[PDB]
RNA sequence: GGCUCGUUGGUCUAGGGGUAUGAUUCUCGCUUAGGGUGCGAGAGGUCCCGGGUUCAAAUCCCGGACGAGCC
């Protein structure tokens, strides 16, 4: 015995997989210097306002 | 119905920066009898001292 | 090595039917000889992936290593 007990979720229902990335790389195309929010692969339109974020 | 996922604790980190300190030795200069907050080398403690030097 | 499916993004956290919270960090200021350290701001999610079930079940039930197919 070690006078201590408890548990952990063992990530059985809490783990995933994602390709090689960093906080200076894009999750959509894997390039460096930007993020998916600015990815050059995207059509960058059309867009506009919505009540859910403007009212 | 019941569920369980372990029997003992786990860790995902630790520390060593505390360097086995004693609350009688300054972390700023290593001298004994005071703390950094009262170091005689600080510009605003324990009594606002100032260093000196020469060139002649 | 190429082609096809790319937007998984703090990290951690128990989760027995419904948006998060807490632990900690990172960035800036104060020192820059501080690890007895702190405080405010900036950075945190419709919280494993797919199929089945009544309005709804992260452990509702089932499969499941670090992906798969073709050249
Ligand atoms: Zn991109
Ligand atoms: Zn000192």
CATH for B34: 4.10.60.10
Give the domain extent around A28: 1-55
Beta-carbon contacts of residue B6 (< 8 Å; ≥ 6 apart): A6, A7, A8, A10
A31 close to A21: Cβ distance less than 8 angstroms: no
Q: Give the C-alpha distances (Å, rounded to integers) separating B35 from A25, B9, B15, B25, B41.
A: 44, 36, 21, 6, 11
Task: Region of B45 please: left (phi>0), alpha (psi -120 to 50) or beta.
Answer: beta
Contact assignment for B8 to A12 by CB distance below 8 Å: no
Q: Give the C-alpha distances (Å, rounded to integers) separating B38 from B2, B51, B52.
A: 58, 16, 19
Nearest residue on chain B to A7, judged by CA atoms? B6
How many separate domains does chain A show?
A: 1
Which ligand is closest to the CA of A25, given by its number?
1
Mutate to test the interface with B, among A2, A3, A4, A8 (most CBs of B within 10 A): A8
Nearest to B36 by CA among B51, B21, B20: B21
Q: Give the C-alpha distances (Å, rounded to integers) separating B45 from A8, B25, B49.
A: 48, 16, 7
A10 close to B6: Cβ distance less than 8 angstroms: yes
What end-to-end distance do the CA atoms of chain A give, in Å? 60
What end-to-end distance do the CA atoms of chain B give, in Å? 88
Q: How far is the CA of A45 from the centre of ligand 1 (A)?
A: 15
Query: From the CA of B18, how many Å to the C1' of C18?
Result: 45
Tokens of residue A29, six digits: 């195309």
């Amino acid at each position: 015995a070690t006078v201590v007990s408890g548990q952990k979720q063992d990530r059985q229902g809490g783990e995933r997989r994602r390709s090689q990335l960093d906080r200076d790389q894009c999750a959509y195309c894997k390039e460096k210097g930007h993020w998916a929010k600015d990815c050059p692969k995207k059509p960058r339109g059309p867009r506009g306002p919505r009540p859910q974020t403007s009212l």
